[PDB]
């Protein structure tokens, strides 16, 4: 909902690290939620490499909710990043 307030965040790195600390969990629904959060956060983190690696890794996974969230976040990163777009 609050997408237009995302560019006002100052301490971006701590925010993204705290969000990103859930990709390495083993609950697939939690992982899918965190990739959806990355896709929402796409505007403020266009060129973060570990995010792209997580999207690529979870994109060819076998849990369907993880796959769908990965496609969402790949669509949202692909609108802004270029190396992500070609890979």
């Amino acid at each position: 909902q609050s997408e237009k307030h995302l560019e006002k965040i100052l301490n971006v790195d701590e925010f993204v690290k705290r969000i990103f600390s859930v990709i390495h969990s083993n609950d697939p629904v939690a992982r899918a939620i965190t990739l959806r959060m990355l896709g929402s956060l796409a505007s403020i983190i266009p060129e973060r490499k570990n995010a792209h690696h997580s999207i690529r890794q979870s994109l060819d996974s076998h849990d369907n909710v993880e796959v769908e969230a990965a496609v969402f976040a790949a669509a949202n990163f692909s609108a802004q990043s270029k190396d992500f777009a070609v890979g």
Binding site: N26, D27, V29, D63
Partner: protein
């Protein structure tokens, strides 16, 4: 169609295990048939935390719980090869040796018949346990051999150094020699 039901049930069990590990501990204390032990370990990632209570499960006075703990640990060591898994594997070898010291013959058969493939799994997972594993085998072999000499037998396996409802002792000796065959052919083709 069986595999689809199996993987769906594995998904639900993984969700229920990550919801609360106490259910996983209670279920593995209760036990399930060993033919599910591959499927439950290969398919549910959460069984990694199952390596937390194998020392506790192997310490229970009940015996079939100890066979279940040994078999579950073996399949976990096949799946996850970690220093934690190797340490609990060494503990398992020590527990099997101690129970070899303390077991009645009928209970010795009932304990050592379903375990011995787990020793193949332990040896396949970790090279540094080989000789330790080997030591246990040679010990169990000769103690079973001594039991064969205690009473008359219908097959006389002692003089069969060349290659149904039988005596339990010759069945245990045959299980020991077959698990040695499996270990050797695993080692030869293991590159």
């Amino acid at each position: 169609n069986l595999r689809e039901v199996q993987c769906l049930i594995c998904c639900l069990l993984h969700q229920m295990y990550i919801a609360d590990p106490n259910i996983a501990k209670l279920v593995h204390f209760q036990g399930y048939p060993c033919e599910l032990l591959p499927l439950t370990v290969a398919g549910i990632p959460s069984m990694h935390i199952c390596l937390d209570f194998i020392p506790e499960l192997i310490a229970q006075p009940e015996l079939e719980k100890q066979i279940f703990a040994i078999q579950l640990l073996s399949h976990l060591c096949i799946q996850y090869a970690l220093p934690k898994s190797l340490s609990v594997a060494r503990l398992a070898v020590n527990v099997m040796g101690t129970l070899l010291t303390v077991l009645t013959q009928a209970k010795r058969y009932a304990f050592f018949m379903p375990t011995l493939p787990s020793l193949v799994s332990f040896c396949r997972a970790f090279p540094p346990l080989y000789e330790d594993i080997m030591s246990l085998l040679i010990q169990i072999g000769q103690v079973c051999a001594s039991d064969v000499a205690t009473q008359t037998r219908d097959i006389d396996p002692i003089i069969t150094r060349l290659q149904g409802s039988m005596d339990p002792d010759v069945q245990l000796c045959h299980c020991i020699e077959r698990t040695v065959i499996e270990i050797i052919n695993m080692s030869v083709s293991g590159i």
